[PDB]
Each structure stands twice: as structure tokens, then as C-alpha cells.
């Protein structure tokens, strides 16, 4: 079943006992999921339930050989987008993208991955936020979460999505 992992953790990180929710640690360290792909156009959902005032939390795809302890966006393995002031990051450098995300949304992420016979798109209430960058590298693509003080976000992989868009032909990760 498409779920989380056991040793994909820091000891200050708390992967919750439902394997559908991560509990935030007040610093900045990276937790990641367990079921990813390498080639194709795929999709999952992160349901952001509750948020404090004046937060900082970054979400996006990642590759497992990155940093286990970083805020997301520190490496060339992964991209990110911040909950405050809406910034895309390449090795965590301020490059203004949008305005960030708040309380009560679903951050359901799209990937695009061609091959000789690649972009990362973020959604938020179905809104096509645009394109972060183009032609990303080769590897296994896990999701990645790093959080603020102990807030509440939920993950989702079932085909009964909360916000299914109608602009691209995507597939759920639970087909694995």
C-alpha cells in the first residue's frame, strides 16, 4: 500500500500513528514519503488542514539522496514553495514566485517527466500556480515535507481526491 516509511525520519520528527499526517517540529528538518516514480506524469495530494499565524513550511517533490535535515529547497534534488511570501527555491535562494499558502487548502502536486523514446507544478485549490523550473534530473521522486511549530497537514493518495483539476491528464500514485 502507498504509505510512508519507517526510517525516513529524524528523532525530532514525529511521523504520526495514522501514516496520513506529519506532526511539525519547531525547527526545520526534512521528512519524506516512500512511494515515488522515475518517469511519467503522476499526482498525489497534501491536504493542509490547520495553520498558525506567521508560519514557514515548504512542500514539493524530492529525491532520497538529499539532505535528511534541511528545510525543503536546499538541494538540486528537490524544489519547494514556501507558505509565507510564496517563493520558489533552487538551493534555497530567494526568487519571488507568488504569495504563499494558508489554512484550509490541498497542495496536490503534479510532475512531468519525459525521456528519449521535465517540470514540477504545484496546485492550490485547483489553481495552476505555474512552472517552477524545467528539465530536472534523473532519480526516484519522493514527496517532501518540512514544517513550522506543531501544525496539522494531511497527505492523500486515494482516487477520491478533494480537489481534482480538469486541466491535465494525471494518474494517482496508489496504482503502485
Amino acid at each position: 500500500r502507498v504509505l510512508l516509511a519507517l526510517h525516513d525520519r529524524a528523532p525530532q520528527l514525529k511521523i504520526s500513528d495514522d501514516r496520513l499526517t506529519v506532526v511539525g517540529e519547531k525547527g526545520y528538518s526534512m521528512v519524506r514519503a516512500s512511494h515515488g516514480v522515475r518517469k511519467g506524469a503522476w499526482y498525489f495530494e497534501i491536504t493542509v488542514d490547520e495553520m498558525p499565524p506567521d508560519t514557514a513550511a515548504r512542500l514539493g517533490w524530492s529525491q532520497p539522496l538529499g539532505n535528511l535535515q534541511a528545510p525543503l529547497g536546499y538541494d538540486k534534488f528537490s524544489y519547494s514553495w514556501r507558505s509565507k511570501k510564496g517563493t520558489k527555491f533552487h538551493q534555497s535562494i530567494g526568487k519571488h514566485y507568488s504569495s504563499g499558502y494558508g489554512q484550509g487548502d490541498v497542495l496536490g502536486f503534479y510532475i512531468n517527466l519525459p525521456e528519449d523514446t521535465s517540470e514540477i507544478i504545484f496546485y492550490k485549490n485547483g489553481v495552476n500556480q505555474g512552472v517552477a523550473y524545467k528539465d530536472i534530473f534523473e532519480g526516484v521522486y519522493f514527496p517532501a515535507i518540512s514544517l513550522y511549530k506543531s501544525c496539522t497537514v494531511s497527505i492523500n493518495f486515494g482516487p477520491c481526491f478533494k480537489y481534482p483539476p480538469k486541466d491535465l491528464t494525471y494518474r494517482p500514485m496508489s496504482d503502485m
Partner: protein, 347 residues
């Protein structure tokens, strides 16, 4: 304010007296065989050795210009020197041996010299026109006198107890009082010293009591006054007679040396309590005590040994870090994630 031992000087034996300039750079160590050894502070060296005489050099006094000492001995010569190459400019072979010399602070042609027996008479440099300072009684045989701070007056002191004040050159009798020593028995005077800011001054009496007065108070008293003292100092436990007194660099901390025990006592002008007793080699007898005007370090002359008494800055040097304050337990704050004025620089 001095609290340590800090070092001493085994350079030239038989030290007898010293004093300083306005700036506090050199040290004119008076010697028994007619010498003035000059030692430096910031370089710790002996620059010039003036082999002046062969007789005990008793008194010394620096002037304001930084060029003209004045001394006397049992050689009984009112000498003078210069620190460039040891130039004895003048030589006054006089009778009646000397106790203390003293300039006027800015009219340095006029020096004030205390003989052995009769009244202090104001000498000069060039001419022999000594200005007779009229003491009335003249039966006391030991009368001491001095200026004020700015050289604006002349203060005197007999051995009976009567104090007279004259103008610095024309001798206006403006103040007259006898000291309130005991009830029926008065006492003599041995020294009167003055500060570098203000007109407070001490009366080194001889019933083991120091008395302190101000200049404005006695100028308000004037002729036939009864000035009460600002402060009465003594030491009733150890029953100690006094040798030499002085002042601090601001006229706040009186430094009076003993005459029996080789110890310094330090008071306050305002409150009037003892603050610290200093000590040294217990087997000496102390004669002269020098205070440094801009930085509080004391010199003590006994048995040819002169000692430097600082406080070492044990607090710390804090030159580098006005910043960087200390947190005792491991305090963590790791939540966080992130042309107006024209002053004459050429002044």
C-alpha cells in the same frame, strides 16, 4: 584605587623624597649622597642621573613648564636643574637649613622656601629681593607656609596654633584664627597640602588628628573666625602619629602615611570612613609618600625602597566585547528562519 603589591624598585639605594610634575611621567628620587635619580613609568627606565651634590637632598619641587626643579640640602644651596642634560643654572649658597620649597604655579619666577628657624620668606630666581612675610610672634621657631591651589593667596602656620593668610605678593592680612585643638592645650602644624581641583585642604596637626578645611569657608570666616572642620580624621585603635599627608587626583581620597608601622591609610573626603589599609615590608619605617595625579598609583619611600601599588584590573580588560553577553544554561531561540548627520570630521 590601589589594592595590590604590584612590584617595587631595586635600582638605587638611599631614597629620601620625591614628587611629580603635572603629567605624571617621571620620578625624581632624592638621595642621601646628593643625587636625583629620574625613573620613567611607561618605559620603566632611568633616563638621567643628576649627581647633584654630596649632602642629603631634603626638599624637591617640580614647576609647571617641565624644565625647572628646585632643591636644597645640608649643603644649604638652593639649587636648580633641567632635565635635558643636567644643567645647574643657579646656585644659592645660603644659611639656615631648609625644609620645603614651593613654586607659585604659573608665576614660576617666585618660589617659596621654608628655613630652619625663622619665617618662610619668598625667594625668587634671578634677584635676591626676598619678600619678607611678617610673622608676628616669632618665638615658635618652626613656622610653615604655602600658597593655595591657583597661587592666589599665601596660607601660613605657626607652632602655637594661630593661622594667618596673606596675599600672594603684597601680603594682605585677611584671615586670622587659632585652631581648636583640645580645650586648654593647642598643638603645632607639620604640613598643609592642596589639591588639583577645588580649594579643600588638610591641617596636619600634632595631636594625631588630621583636620580638613575649605578655602571658601575660611574666606567667609576671614579675620577673627572660628572655622569648624569639614572632617576630623584619626585612628584610635592603633594610636598612631602622622608623618606626611597628601590628596587624591580629584581631592576625594586622602592618603596619609604612618610614622611608626609602614602602612598607608586611605579615607574619603565626603563620607570620612577608612576604605583600605595598605601594607608592605613589615620591618621598615616610612618617610615619604607620593600620589600620582591622573592614575591612582602610590609610591612609598623607606630604606631606599620605592614601591609601585596598582590594582591590576582584575575585573578584566573589556576592549573587544561590549557585545557577546553570556547565557548560563543552553538557551535556544532557534524558531526564527530569516546619511543622517554631518559633523566636522576635519575639526
Amino acid at each position: 584605587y590601589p589594592e595590590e603589591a604590584d612590584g617595587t624598585l631595586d635600582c638605587i639605594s638611599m631614597a629620601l623624597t620625591c614628587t611629580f610634575n603635572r603629567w605624571g611621567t617621571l620620578l625624581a628620587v632624592g638621595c642621601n649622597d646628593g643625587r636625583i635619580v629620574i625613573w620613567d613609568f611607561l618605559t620603566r627606565g632611568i633616563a638621567k642621573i643628576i649627581s647633584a651634590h654630596i649632602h642629603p637632598v631634603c626638599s624637591l619641587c617640580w614647576s609647571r613648564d617641565g624644565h625647572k626643579l628646585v632643591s636644597a640640602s645640608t649643603d644649604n644651596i638652593v639649587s636648580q636643574w633641567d632635565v635635558l642634560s643636567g644643567d645647574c643654572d643657579q646656585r644659592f649658597r645660603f644659611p639656615s637649613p631648609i625644609l620645603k620649597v614651593q613654586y607659585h604655579p604659573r608665576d614660576q619666577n617666585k618660589v617659596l622656601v621654608c628655613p630652619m628657624k625663622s619665617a618662610p620668606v619668598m625667594l625668587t630666581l634671578s634677584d635676591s629681593k626676598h619678600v619678607v612675610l611678617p610673622v608676628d610672634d616669632d618665638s615658635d621657631l618652626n613656622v610653615v607656609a604655602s600658597f593655595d591651589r591657583r597661587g592666589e593667596y599665601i596660607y601660613t602656620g605657626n607652632a602655637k596654633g594661630k593661622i594667618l593668610v596673606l596675599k600672594t605678593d603684597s601680603q594682605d592680612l585677611v584671615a586670622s584664627f587659632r585652631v581648636t585643638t583640645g580645650t586648654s592645650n593647642t598643638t603645632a602644624i607639620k604640613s598643609i597640602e592642596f589639591a588639583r581641583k577645588g580649594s579643600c585642604f588638610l591641617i596636619n596637626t600634632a595631636d594625631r588628628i588630621i583636620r580638613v578645611y575649605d578655602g571658601r569657608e575660611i574666606l567667609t570666616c576671614g579675620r577673627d573666625g572660628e572655622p569648624e572642620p569639614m572632617q576630623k580624621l584619626q585612628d584610635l585603635v592603633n594610636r598612631t602619629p602622622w608623618k606626611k599627608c597628601c590628596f587624591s587626583g580629584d581631592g576625594e581620597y586622602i592618603v596619609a602615611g604612618s610614622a611608626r608601622q609602614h602602612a598607608l591609610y586611605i579615607w574619603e573626603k565626603s563620607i570620612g570612613n577608612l576604605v583600605k589599609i595598605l601594607h608592605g615590608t613589615r620591618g621598615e619605617l616610612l618617610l615619604d609618600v607620593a600620589w600620582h595625579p591622573v592614575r591612582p598609583i602610590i609610591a612609598s619611600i623607606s630604606s631606599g625602597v620605592v614601591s609601585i601599588w596598582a590594582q591590576n584590573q582584575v575585573e578584566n580588560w573589556s576592549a573587544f566585547a561590549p557585545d557577546f553577553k553570556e547565557l548560563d544554561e543552553n538557551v535556544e531561540y532557534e524558531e526564527r528562519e530569516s546619511e543622517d548627520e554631518e559633523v566636522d570630521v576635519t575639526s
